[PDB]
Structures are given as C-alpha cells and as structure tokens.
Ligand SMILES: *[C@H]1O[C@H](CO[C@]2(C(=O)O)C[C@H](O)[C@@H](NC(C)=O)[C@H]([C@H](O)[C@H](O)CO)O2)[C@H](O)[C@H](O)[C@H]1NC(C)=O
C-alpha cells in the first residue's frame with residue numbers, strides 16, 4: 001500500500017532552480033517525516049534534510065546552505081524539495097524516503113542533470129580495420145558515437161539480430177558533450193560479405209542513426 | 216558529522232561462498248545501524264536494522280552483527296542475484312550518514328584481453344578530428360593498465376577511458392580507451408600503439424598501426 005512516487009527527470013541550466021516532488025499514498029501523510037537523499041555516481045549518499053508534515057518541523061543539513069527549501073501540501077499528500085543556484089555538481093539522483101529509518105519505503109528517485117549544453121544528436125563515425133598483414137578468422141568493427149546531449153543513447157548492431165560479441169561502453173564527457181564507443185566481433189567470413197550496421201537511438205533529439213560499416 | 220567507512224569498494228566471491236562486508240563508525244552509534252542492498256537503476260532495499268535484526272522478507276542467508284563502531288553484514292551461500300551494491304546507514308544522529316558502498320563481484324578464471332585498435336575514420340578526419348580507439352574486451356580480473364604511444368613515446372593528454380561492469384553472462388570486464396587528436400596533429404606521426412598490462416601476461420599486449 002505504502003508508495004512514495006516522485007516527479008520526472010529534470011534537466012536545467014547552471015544558476016537555475018528546480019522543484020522535485022514526492023507524492024505519498026497508502027498511509028496518513030502526517031504520521032511520518034519525509035527525508036531527502038542525494039546519490040551521485042560512485043560517491044556516497046548525502047542526507048539533505050527532512051520535513052515533518054504533522055508537526056511542521058524542518059531540519060536541513062548545513063552542507064547544502066541556502067541551496068534547499070523543503071515544503072509539503074497536506075492537501076495532495078506531497079512533499080517537495082526546491083533547489084536553487086544549481087551547478088553541475090548538483091547533478092545526481094535524488095530520493096525521498098519515509099522516516100529516518102526508511103526500510104523499503106523509498107521513492108523511485110529523480111534524476112537531475114545540470115548543464116549549459118544544448119540538446120544535440122550524435123555524430124556517428126565507423127570503426128573498420130584497414131588491410132592486415134595476415135589472415136584472421138575473426139574481425140572487430142565499431143561505432144564512435146560522438147558529441148550528443150543529453151544522455152541516454154542506445155546502440156544495437158543489425159537491429160539487435162547481432163548481440164553476442166557486442167560491447168557498448170558508458171559515455172564520457174568530451175567538450176561538454178557525451179561520447180561513447182561500441183565494438184562488435186564477428187567471423188571474417190560474414191564481413192564484409194554481409195552488411196554490418198550500428199543502430200544508434202537518441203530519444204531526446206528523436207534521432208536514429210544507422211551507420212553501415214564498409215571496408 | 217558521523218563518518219561511516221566501509222572496508223572495501225569491491226569484493227570477489229563465488230556462488231555458495233560466504234562473504235562479509237564491514238562498516239566502521241567514527242564514533243559510537245550503539246546499534247543504530249542499517250544495511251541496504253541497491254541494484255543499478257533501482258531504489259535501496261533494507262536487509263538489516265538495529266545492526267542485527269533481519270527485515271521480514273529478507274533471505275536467512277543475510278545476517279548482521281556488531282555494536283558501538285564496528286558492524287558486519289554477512290552473506291552466506293552467496294547467490295548471483297546478490298552480486299550488487301551494499302551500504303550501511305547510521306541513524307543515531309543527524310545528519311544521517313552512509314557508507315560509500317561495496318560491490319560484490321564473481322570470481323572466474325583469469326582471461327587475457329582481446330585487443331583491437333582502430334585508426335580514425337576518413338569521415339572523422341575530414342571533419343578535422345582524429346580519435347584512435349582501442350578496445351580491450353573480455354578480460355579478468357578487472358585490474359588493467361593501458362598506455363598509448365605515438366612514434367614510440369608515451370602519450371597521456373587526450374586519452375579518455377571507459378569501463379563496463381562485470382558481464383552477466385561470462386563474468387569478464389571490458390574497457391575502451393580513446394586518444395583524440397586534431398587531424399593536423401595525427402598527420403605528423405607514423406605509429407600509434409595501444410599497450411595493455413594485465414596479470415595474465417608478463418609482457419604488455421601491444422596492438423599498433425602505422426599510417
Ligand atoms: C521517527 O520515526 C517515526 C516512525 O516510527 C516508526 C513507526 O512506527 O512508523 C517506529 C518503528 O519502530 C520503525 N520501524 C523499525 C523497524 O524500527 C518505523 C519505520 O522506521 C517507519 O515506519 C519507516 O517508514 O518507524 C516517524 O516517521 C517520525 O516522523 C520519525 N521522525 C523523524 C524526524 O524522521
């Protein structure tokens with residue numbers, strides 16, 4: 001019955017602020033304080049603060065000074081976190097949770113990305129071998145998926161019909177945009193005699209790139 | 216603030232084995248401690264609270280111990296679904312604070328990387344860029360070092376690396392290393408080498424090409 005349901009992913013510029021909300025359901029909203037937690041890739045969790053709806057008690061972590069304002073609207077059973085003066089270091093997944101010891105009562109999380117980058121589709125460059133000196137029964141090809149924003153992109157090869165022997169890597173940041181690479185390793189008897197295409201989808205720009213790898 | 220130090224960022228185990236994850240508090244929190252599991256993408260799930268009480272629904276394979284500053288989560292009879300992230304939380308004092316997390320990984324036979332280096336495409340070059348990409352696929356263990364050389368001499372500037380997590384099917388790791396130059400810089404040199412050192416070989420694995 002107990003559910004904490006958060007608002008959708010946010011993407012915002014440096015300097016802006018944002019409101020992330022948390023709709024509680026299946027219990028009496030005033031029975032339990034709502035806590036907020038920040039999770040940044042690799043690094044730990046940071047507790048942000050809590051709001052006690054039936055009480056009005058608000059505690060903050062000094063760490064996030066004048067950065068955070070917590071609210072609640074008893075009418076819709078919703079707790080909110082307003083963040084201001086955002087920087088790219090605020091990019092993280094933010095969670096609400098029920099009580100100081102939450103057990104399984106966490107929200108699903110809200111992704112915040114803070115960036116000055118514009119939405120930009122990937123440019124896709126083919127990776128193919130030139131002539132080798134010896135005969136290889138296997139061959140590796142790839143795609144360099146460069147300069148897109150925001151995350152994510154998905155990559156398949158020959159529309160998924162080719163999936164064993166594929167490696168797609170996490171993106172890195174390169175000039176304020178994302179770059180990733182993908183490899184596929186196939187028998188040399190199947191390429192270039194048969195067509196191999198990397199399929200790149202970037203939902204944010206509604207873009208699909210189908211790059212054929214030619215010798 | 217109360218600092219929670221978790222022993223190890225990575226531990227290796229085998230299905231059926233027992234493994235323990237420690238967490239040290241920078242001061243006494245009695246038993247005001249919780250252990251959480253967290254899978255990629257998902258929200259945390261409690262395993263233990265009061266340092267030793269198992270939450271209803273959690274397999275009996277998971278136990279917790281300790282009181283004061285030192286706490287241990289133990290997983291007996293490890294299953295593959297358990298190969299994920301675990302962190303501790305102290306709740307004696309605000310701010311609430313958390314361990315940085317421990318990832319459990321599967322032991323498997325050693326495996327040398329399969330290495331492939333690619334020159335920049337002509338399409339990239341015509342746009343004034345030269346990314347040389349090196350894949351180091353399907354190796355184990357995770358620890359690996361990649362060095363680039365141009366005309367025999369080490370290059371550091373312009374390299375970006377990316378690493379996968381352990382593969383769900385074969386338990387290997389893969390890495391990509393990309394050296395990006397201008398077209399003009401690329402064109403001043405002859406030889407481009409990706410060198411990998413891994414415990415499977417006493418000599419580096421070297422893949423290379425010449426323009
Ligand atoms: C302090 O915590 C209360 C809720 O108290 C309980 C509860 O009964 O709901 C006490 C109970 O013993 C807790 N369970 C366990 C296993 O210890 C229970 C759970 O932690 C909770 O139900 C999970 O959501 O909490 C209020 O939430 C109160 O607001 C809170 N104070 C603050 C500042 O967070």
Ligand SMILES: *[C@H]1O[C@H](CO[C@]2(C(=O)O)C[C@H](O)[C@@H](NC(C)=O)[C@H]([C@H](O)[C@H](O)CO)O2)[C@H](O)[C@H](O)[C@H]1NC(C)=O
Nearest residue numbers: 030031032033034050051052053054055056057058059
């Ligand atoms: C039950 O109460 C807790 C917190 O309790 C206090 C607190 O802030 O510690 C008790 C404290 O003595 C009060 N402060 C002072 C100076 O008297 C304080 C006030 O009542 C509050 O600050 C007024 O704004 O409350 C949590 O707030 C917890 O959420 C609450 N339980 C529920 C379910 O709301």
